[PDB]
Amino acid sequence: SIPWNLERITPPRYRADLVEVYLLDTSIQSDHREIEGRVMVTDFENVPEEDGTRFHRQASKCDSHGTHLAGVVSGRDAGVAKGASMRSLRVLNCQGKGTVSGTLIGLEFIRKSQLVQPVGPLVVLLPLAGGYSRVLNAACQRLARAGVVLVTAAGNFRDDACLYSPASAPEVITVGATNAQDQPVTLGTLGTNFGRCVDLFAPGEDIIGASSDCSTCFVSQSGTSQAAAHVAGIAAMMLSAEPELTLAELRQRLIHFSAKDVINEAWFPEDQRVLTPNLVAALPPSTHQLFCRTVWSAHSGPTRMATAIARCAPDEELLSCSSFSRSGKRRGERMEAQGGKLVCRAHNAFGGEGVYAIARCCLLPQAACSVHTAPPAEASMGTRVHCHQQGHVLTGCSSHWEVEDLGTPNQCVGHREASIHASCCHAPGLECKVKEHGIPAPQGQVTVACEEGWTLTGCSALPGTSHVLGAYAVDNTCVVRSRAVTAVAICCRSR
Amino acid sequence: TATFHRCAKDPWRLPGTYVVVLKEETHLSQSERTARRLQAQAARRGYLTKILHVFHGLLPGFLVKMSGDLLELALKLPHVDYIEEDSSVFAQ
């Protein structure tokens, strides 16, 4: 007798035991019984005028979209974070249209009001999308660096979310929509966006919530707006119980406690299936492990000295770096410093497609990490490198070379003609071990997983095989992709 | 050098309004003066312009309603990092 979507984000072993949520959307019906007295209408309003040739103010329900979303986040009976406190800003007109420039002015208003109210956690819900905007993504990043949790809709266009903003801003939590069968929502002939800029999915079809028709009325709605509102509710409950969760910690926990592999990825275009996280959001038991996430770069492009680069959040360490090419014409990957922070750069061959760089990004408190490299050796034992300093643990191995004529504890081994790069980290109680799995007849992929209690930090293929497309981590499983091949996982934990 | 940016989705473009983003560390009084200098340069060429907003706090710069004819002029202003043409966002 409770809405399917509220049940869906509530995990099996759920135990129900200061945060401001800002909503940038249409006007809202603040009198509605779901939100009465818990949502305050700020005086912020910056919207373009309606298209008057189609606008009949007498008939229009200007409050319908925002009221429903406020109810999904914090409604008394049907909300995710019931009774949570909210502040609404109007950046969409009655016809659901706004501007990048008005949205920026709304984000600046949030920044101003953050410096005035007592310091505390704030969530900003952005249930809107336009085309990729450099300025809008930059404003979102600057707010994220001030400790704001930004949550946004992936977009409703059955398209790559990286073409939309603020969906494409990396530090914003980008939410796609799934239905009661945990499949991607279709909306008309389109539906939820997908791709490497989506962080997770959440219920976004047939979502019951406050209707501005009347103060006690309810209505079902569908879209990635509704899904983002679910994750903003989840964030608000997490931050209500742990007010000094950082955004980075919050994002890793959202990823970690989501339902895995419940989506049939055949819905997505083939070349987006590896880029799109198979995650449906759920409330983490939380209230408090080594958390890691995979970060795919953009495709490098068919220039054949072109590079792809994958980066971690500021609070995270880059523990390993791999690469992938759909036809295997790559020159490997390299961990390198850029402004005193360590990035993952993959290199293209010299004919054809392009490459992805794939970073493994982890929350490792009080860590001091570094990369150590060895030039190509030209020796039968190959190129070797290892973490010489005491208490420095090997978390990942990278390898890049120069031209494609390759064919004949705590250490990295690579081809004779390749440079080899070791990620080494010092952290209290960090311990790591290697697991391997080899298959003589590789049917496209060989995998190996870390046991429960361990976290996959590094994923790699054993060198000396011309039939390797690349390697990447999927949660705690190392995945090597072939056209005898061995997958090599590095698994770590903390005390 | 200062670059110009616009929405890739052509029907979502809103030409005639521009966000001028100034280099990082630019102070409010310099954004304020850069906006007034753009207005004065454009007025000398026969163009009316409107400063709609001067940003400070998130990013430094300003919002200007003006003819796209003036983009080349605006790109040569001191402190300019890049200029973005306004565009639409939509309820999802």
Partner: antibody, heavy 123, light 112 residues
Framework: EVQLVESGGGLVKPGGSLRLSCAAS????????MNWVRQAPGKGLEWVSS????????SYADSVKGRFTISRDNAKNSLYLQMNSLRAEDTAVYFC????????????????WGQGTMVTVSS | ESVLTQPPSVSGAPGQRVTISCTGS?????????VHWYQQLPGTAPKLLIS???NRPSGVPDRFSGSKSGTSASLAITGLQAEDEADYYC???????????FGGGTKLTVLG
């Protein structure tokens, strides 16, 4: 089973009035725009009127402007067409059809149609 | 007298390939709005056939394809079958009319 069922057709004299209705089931009606399309016997499809999910966009073919009024009631999962000052050339089958409301960001296909209700205007 | 122009009729024998054109103007197809196509079997409601210039709904065979270029669009049917005998309608939003207008329709006849 997504479904649209229009009703209210009949025979009417010129200058008369009729109210069509369209009942939706099996989908999230309040997130879809709705449309009337008509087809005179042996003729082509003619768009009549559209109304968005929150009624903030409403438009009309020129040929019916000022005589027809579209409205919807999301709580009753219903779409309406009030037709006044009917003329013989309004004789047609009237279909309702949905399109997901992208708030003018995209104009999608009419992906589900009803079966139509017949309207005859005759002296 | 429709805003989008289609040929009144087309025909082919089973197995042939036929095309149906749809030409508009700068206020609809030429303004960046997609073309959608509908098939109406005799005595039935229209059903969606191609959406967004070239996408096939579930249940529409890959014999049907669509494209769009400039102010014109085209529907192509390969491997013509008898059950393809029907009326075909293109559709597009027109910004000067504020509505999604229909072509005049094309009657497809299966010969032979």
């Amino acid at each position: 089973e997504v479904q649209l069922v229009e009703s209210g057709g009949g025979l009417v004299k010129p200058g008369g009035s009729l109210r069509l209705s369209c009942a939706a089931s099996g989908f999230t009606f309040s997130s879809y725009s709705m449309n009337w399309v008509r087809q005179a016997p042996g003729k082509g499809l003619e768009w009549v009127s559209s109304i968005s999910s929150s009624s903030s966009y409403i438009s009309y073919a020129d040929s019916v402007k000022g005589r027809f009024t579209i409205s919807r009631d999301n709580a009753k999962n219903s779409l309406y067409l009030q037709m006044n000052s009917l003329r013989a050339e309004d004789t047609a089958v009237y279909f309702c059809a949905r399109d997901y409301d992208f708030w003018s960001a995209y104009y999608d296909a009419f992906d589900v149609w009803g079966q139509g209700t017949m309207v005859t205007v005759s002296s | 007298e429709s805003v989008l122009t289609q040929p009144p009729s087309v025909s082919g024998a089973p197995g042939q390939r036929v095309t149906i054109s749809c030409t508009g103007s700068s206020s609809n197809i030429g303004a960046g709005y997609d073309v959608h196509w509908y098939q109406q079997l005799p005595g039935t409601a229209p059903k969606l056939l191609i959406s967004g210039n070239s996408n096939r709904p579930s249940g529409v065979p890959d014999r049907f394809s669509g494209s769009k270029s400039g102010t014109s669009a085209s529907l192509a049917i390969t491997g013509l079958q008898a059950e393809d005998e029907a009326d075909y309608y293109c559709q597009s939003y027109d910004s000067s009319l504020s509505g999604s207008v229909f072509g005049g329709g094309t009657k497809l006849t299966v010969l032979g």
